[PDB]
Design a protein around this ligand. Structure first.
Ligand SMILES: [Mg+2]
Ligand SMILES: [Mg+2]
Ligand SMILES: [Mg+2]
Ligand SMILES: [Mg+2]
Ligand SMILES: [Mg+2]
Ligand SMILES: [Mg+2]
Ligand SMILES: [Mg+2]
Ligand SMILES: [Mg+2]
Ligand SMILES: [Mg+2]
Ligand SMILES: [Mg+2]
Ligand SMILES: [Mg+2]
Ligand SMILES: [Mg+2]
Ligand SMILES: [Mg+2]
Ligand SMILES: [Mg+2]
Ligand SMILES: [Mg+2]
Ligand SMILES: [Mg+2]
Ligand SMILES: [Mg+2]
Ligand SMILES: [Mg+2]
Ligand SMILES: [Mg+2]
Ligand SMILES: [Mg+2]
Ligand SMILES: [Mg+2]
Ligand SMILES: [Mg+2]
Ligand SMILES: [Mg+2]
Ligand SMILES: [Mg+2]
Ligand SMILES: [Mg+2]
Ligand SMILES: [Mg+2]
Ligand SMILES: [Mg+2]
Ligand SMILES: [Mg+2]
Ligand SMILES: [Mg+2]
Ligand SMILES: [Mg+2]
Ligand SMILES: [Mg+2]
Ligand SMILES: [Mg+2]
Ligand SMILES: [Mg+2]
Ligand SMILES: [Mg+2]
Ligand SMILES: [Mg+2]
Ligand SMILES: [Mg+2]
Ligand SMILES: [Mg+2]
Ligand SMILES: [Mg+2]
Ligand SMILES: [Mg+2]
Ligand SMILES: [Mg+2]
Ligand SMILES: [Mg+2]
Ligand SMILES: [Mg+2]
Ligand SMILES: [Zn+2]
Lengths: 25, 102, 102, 129, 144
RNA sequence: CUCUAACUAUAAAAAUCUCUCUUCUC
RNA sequence: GGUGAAAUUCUUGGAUUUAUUGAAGACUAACUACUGCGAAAGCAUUUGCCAAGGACGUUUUCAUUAAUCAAGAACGAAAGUUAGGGGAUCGAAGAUGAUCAGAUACCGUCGUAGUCUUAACCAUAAACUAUGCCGACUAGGGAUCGGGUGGUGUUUUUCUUAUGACCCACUCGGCACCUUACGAGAAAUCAAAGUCUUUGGGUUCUGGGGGGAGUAUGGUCGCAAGGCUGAAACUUAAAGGAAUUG
RNA sequence: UUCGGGUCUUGUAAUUGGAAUGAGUACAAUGUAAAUACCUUAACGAGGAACAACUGGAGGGCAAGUCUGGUGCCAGCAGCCGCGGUAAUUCCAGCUCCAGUAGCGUAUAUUAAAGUUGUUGCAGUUAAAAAGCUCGUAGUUGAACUUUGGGUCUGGUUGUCCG
RNA sequence: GGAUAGUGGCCUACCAUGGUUUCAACGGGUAACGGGGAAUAAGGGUUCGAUUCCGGAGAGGGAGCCUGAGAAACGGCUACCA
């Protein structure tokens, strides 16, 4: 992979999981 | 590996240069890696001067020339044959092609 | 690419710990899974001398040897190319609950 | 900024010697260089050399004879025992048949053999051979 | 030049800076952190007695094809579960599952040797007696 | 031992690839 | 129109061009270079104001006031976020008409946020010269920029001196360049990447096989985007660098 | 002149002798508090001197086999590179041979190797790595210069001529 | 001032606001008793030190104490906890 798009994928994963954190509270 | 000692940019001590659009594909390129040609030409082609010459008022008219630079992205410069893919020891020769006619 | 290669046989019957099985789907990494004619779904590994020499696909009766210590897995040995499979169905060594024809 | 003028002096000496020159211009010219060069000269790596007044820090110009091979300075002037002298001699000098570790002693600037015969030892300065 | 300090009174950093860079060597990091004591079921032990559960065949990697006769085992000393290898030809059928087996290292400092994926350990002693003793017909399994 | 003049004008589409890798000593 | 070819789209309410004007915001073409300024980002119409700085000149002034620097701080491209102002161009999203097997991609037209601003966050970039800063030395050659040197110098022109602009020989500083190795490097190459086994000028900050992974977790800054800090379990005999021949 | 005396030696033989002796027994004595054991010593105690040396290994690393038979990408070996798919110098055996030797073989640690933790002694252009840039406390380091030469006597320690 | 055999916030009363710390305090971990040492070896170092010697600590865990010059003893007591 281009490291750029792997970083983007992990970044979006982080955003989704932190929205999960926010919705859980 | 560093391909060109001059880094193939010709900036070398300026930080950042304004960009200029390519003339064919309009790709923005730094105004120094911006291969550039003086397109000076007679307004009429030499093949058709004679028809103009003997069929015109104002005997011995100036017949001016049109002037403009052309700025290419290097992709266009290579494909449109403006710049060739030279060899190694022949890369460090920067003199233009021996003044095409002299 | 046959120049790189090593370049009417008969069937072989199961012998004391091997069974005819019908592949149900082809799994990745070079594995496969097949129904043995016992009411069981076992996991077969495509053996050497077999990997990229002779191919196999879904719906193909094929010989597989069991491993005496772990029955849940097994390794496939000998393939049957669609005409002695009918013969296998004929001789009745394996139950005829599974007919495969196109 | 310049930190140890002796290092600059010896670096100029080595650079100009390697290129094959015969004279060297030492710029800062402090006591320690003068003593160093007298030790050098009495050993013979250097010919008749010269100091110059400047009303400020002076200057040195030193004649060579190509006799030298390499000089050098151990800039952090390490505390050497009378015992650890052999350690430095082994680690710096080519072969004990010759070579001289130059160190400052309670007597003064002094090569290692003088230090051992006077039975004194101080801080190490450089190494010449 | 040589961008580390060289003054007499710089000793401190020359120590502490090294005290930082030592954290690069994996050996040193394992030794100070004691990762051999939390992970790596051998709590620093070169050998451990476990109970065998089942005998498995494990595939091999690309250039080598063969069914390596490995064996699951749960270690008494911690209760963890690992996979080991039987280091001779006719010795898998010496295990007699649900048996006390003594496990040792496997020749690569807590790694996988050769072409046996997902294993870390040999097998040396089975039912008290050493496995190589059985494979040389010098002693016999008690079968108790 | 005297010098610095020419010049042109192209781009449509074309994806994938199963083994088998093997010595240098007089 | 537009393209490789085409269509979408606008057009006898006359589109396209042909002239005058006027509005808006935009940018400052060509001058534009192996040239300049700045700490770096970056900086290009004119003019005035505001303060600032480099270098050069100095038989001027003080006398170690110096260098790098954990901690702390200021700037910090573009995109982004607030809010208010503007709203041309160009264009993420979306809408389209093509190509293709599919193409919600590359080509083609419209079009939102942005693109420009005004105060505040963001502090990341291949923020690259992939060369930390301050020192001293070492080889030949030219030009070029800034200053200052000397010409019985040239045209300048105001008769003549003065300037300015040039020519020469300089010198100090700056971006750089060419040749070479007699130094290095593993080489590509470097005038520093030399003065390093003949191993010591002063100094900060980084790395210890590759993956796991800049991920897990805890802090910490931020509204948010996210940034700084930062592993391990585990998995492998390679990954990687430069060059050679095909 | 082919010789061949093996004339001088070395080895190789299930040929063949007589020497020598301990491990073991054991009279005793010593040894000890008592004793064992050792140190002595009667008498016993070597012929295949069965009174029997193992442990790993023979592709490379690395000393030693391209010998035989078996298995046939299976079993297995292999710390790494790799061997094995019908002629296996790598498995499994037999025969030879290598290495160490009453020792040798593993496994997890640690040390030298490791100039792969670098203070002596590492790299930072691209192989990992120079903070985006600057200021700045602590830390680190920080220009040169303030009695050097001369004269004497004299103590010795070395090599002189040597007594 | 008390208490100690005796100095001492050692403790009590009344005062004052000081003490240490980026020269790493405080906190956390140590499968750490400290040391004489052992392995290792061009030089420089790295690791280990439960243990033949020296100190210290403890006698299941904590506390309390009599006797005695000497113990907060443990093959000496008291109590709690296991
Ligand atoms: Mg600059
Ligand atoms: Mg160019
Ligand atoms: Mg053929
Ligand atoms: Mg298989
Ligand atoms: Mg397909
Ligand atoms: Mg019109
Ligand atoms: Mg302009
Ligand atoms: Mg300019
Ligand atoms: Mg900071
Ligand atoms: Mg913006
Ligand atoms: Mg479409
Ligand atoms: Mg689109
Ligand atoms: Mg588009
Ligand atoms: Mg548009
Ligand atoms: Mg970054
Ligand atoms: Mg790593
Ligand atoms: Mg990663
Ligand atoms: Mg986090
Ligand atoms: Mg390459
Ligand atoms: Mg024997
Ligand atoms: Mg073997
Ligand atoms: Mg053997
Ligand atoms: Mg060999
Ligand atoms: Mg064979
Ligand atoms: Mg063998
Ligand atoms: Mg060594
Ligand atoms: Mg290294
Ligand atoms: Mg890279
Ligand atoms: Mg890299
Ligand atoms: Mg960088
Ligand atoms: Mg930088
Ligand atoms: Mg300071
Ligand atoms: Mg000084
Ligand atoms: Mg300790
Ligand atoms: Mg200890
Ligand atoms: Mg003791
Ligand atoms: Mg006690
Ligand atoms: Mg107990
Ligand atoms: Mg008494
Ligand atoms: Mg007690
Ligand atoms: Mg007691
Ligand atoms: Mg009692
Ligand atoms: Zn272009």
């Amino acid at each position: 992979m281009r490291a750029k798009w792997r970083k983007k994928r992990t970044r979006r994963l982080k955003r989704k999981r932190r929205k999960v954190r926010a919705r859980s509270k | 590996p560093k391909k060109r000692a001059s880094n193939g940019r010709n900036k070398k001590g300026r930080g950042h240069v304004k960009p200029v659009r390519c003339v064919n594909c309009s790709r923005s390129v730094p105004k120094d890696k911006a291969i550039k040609r003086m397109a000076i030409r007679n307004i009429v082609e030499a093949a058709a001067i004679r028809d103009l010459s003997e069929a015109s008022v104002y005997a011995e008219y100036a017949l001016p020339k049109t002037y403009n630079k052309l700025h290419y992205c290097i992709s266009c410069a290579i494909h449109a044959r403006i710049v060739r893919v030279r060899s190694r020891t022949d890369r460090r020769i920067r003199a233009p092609p021996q003044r095409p006619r002299f | 690419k046959g120049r790189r290669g090593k370049n009417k046989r008969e069937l072989i019957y199961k012998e004391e710990g091997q069974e005819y099985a019908q592949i149900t789907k082809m799994l990745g990494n070079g594995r496969v899974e097949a129904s043995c004619f016992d009411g069981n779904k076992r996991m077969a590994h495509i053996r050497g001398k077999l990997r990229k020499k002779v191919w196999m696909g879904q719906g193909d009766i094929i010989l597989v040897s069991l491993r005496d210590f772990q029955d849940d897995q097994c390794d496939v040995v000998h393939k049957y190319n669609l005409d002695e499979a009918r013969t296998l169905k004929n001789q009745g060594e394996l139950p005829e609950n599974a007919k495969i024809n196109e | 900024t310049r930190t140890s003028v002796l290092a600059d002096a010896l670096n100029a000496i080595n650079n100009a010697e390697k290129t094959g020159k015969r004279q060297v211009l030492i710029r800062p010219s402090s006591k320690v260089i003068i003593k160093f060069l007298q030790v050098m000269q009495k050993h013979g790596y250097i010919g008749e050399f010269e100091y110059i007044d400047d009303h400020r820090s002076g200057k040195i110009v030193v004649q060579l004879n190509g006799r030298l091979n390499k000089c050098g300075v151990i800039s952090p002037r390490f505390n050497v025992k009378i015992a650890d002298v052999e350690k430095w001699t082994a680690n710096l000098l080519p072969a004990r048949q010759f070579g001289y570790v130059i160190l400052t002693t309670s007597a003064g600037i002094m090569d290692h053999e003088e230090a051992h015969r006077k039975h004194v030892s101080g801080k190490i300065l450089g190494f010449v051979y | 030049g040589k961008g580390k300090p060289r003054g007499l009174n710089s000793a401190r950093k020359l120590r502490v800076h090294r005290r930082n860079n030592r954290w690069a060597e994996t050996t040193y990091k394992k030794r100070l952190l004691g990762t051999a004591f939390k992970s790596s079921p051998f709590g620093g032990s070169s050998h451990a007695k476990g109970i065998v559960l089942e005998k498995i065949g494990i595939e091999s990697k690309q250039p080598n094809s063969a069914i390596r006769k490995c064996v699951r085992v749960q270690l008494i000393k911690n209760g963890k579960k690992v996979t080991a290898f039987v280091p001779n030809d006719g010795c898998l059928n010496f295990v007699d599952e649900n048996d006390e087996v003594l496990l040792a290292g496997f020749g690569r400092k807590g790694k996988a040797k050769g072409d046996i994926p997902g294993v870390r350990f040999k097998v040396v002693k089975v039912s008290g007696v050493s496995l190589l003793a059985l494979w040389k017909e010098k002693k016999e399994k008690p079968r108790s």
